[PDB]
Write a protein that binds this DNA or RNA. Structure first.
Length: 113
RNA sequence: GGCUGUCGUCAGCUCGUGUUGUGAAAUGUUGGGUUAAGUCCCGCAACGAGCGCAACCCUUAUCCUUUGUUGCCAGCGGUCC
């Protein structure tokens, strides 16, 4: 009756030992996420996303998977929100100058082409 | 000084910002390939930028437009041809 969270996790042994309280139990050579522990973060995530949207905060969609990287563009422009695609290599959030230059000049030259 | 040859029209040389490092410094500037090329894709803590490479300059090849002389003679005339 809950939302998504009827999965079973993806790991055989390569577990970070900081997932001490978030694993429901290991079995059949696969570690299982605490599906039942999916209740709270829904509530807070909604609360702070609503709070940031009160003054219309922006959120970045990121992903580098063969199926999910496009599967976030839909979630971006459905709510007309910021996103990236495959292959986002670091050095722009900290390196603001080069990314600002790149985006403005490159889209302006696309308009100018 | 100026000017010149030189490796060598070889392809490398560095910088801004980031990041990492107490730090000198490293990164960038890496593998696969690829190009004539640090030429470019792919994965990459780096993105970019500068001189670099190409191209922009000159010449050549096809065609067209304009002008037709001292240049040409397809058509016409006879020709001191």
């Amino acid at each position: 009756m809950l939302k998504a969270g009827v999965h079973f996790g993806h790991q055989t042994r390569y577990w970070n030992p900081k997932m001490k309280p978030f694993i429901f139990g290991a079995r059949n050579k696969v570690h299982i996420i605490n599906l039942e522990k999916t209740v709270p973060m829904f509530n807070e995530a909604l609360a702070e996303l609503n709070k940031i949207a009160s003054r219309k905060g922006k959120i970045l969609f990121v992903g580098t998977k063969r199926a999910a990287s496009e599967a976030v563009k839909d979630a971006a422009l459905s709510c007309d929100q910021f996103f990236v695609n495959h292959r986002w290599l670091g050095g722009m959030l900290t390196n603001w100058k080069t990314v600002r230059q790149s985006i403005k000049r490159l889209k302006d030259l696309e308009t100018q082409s």
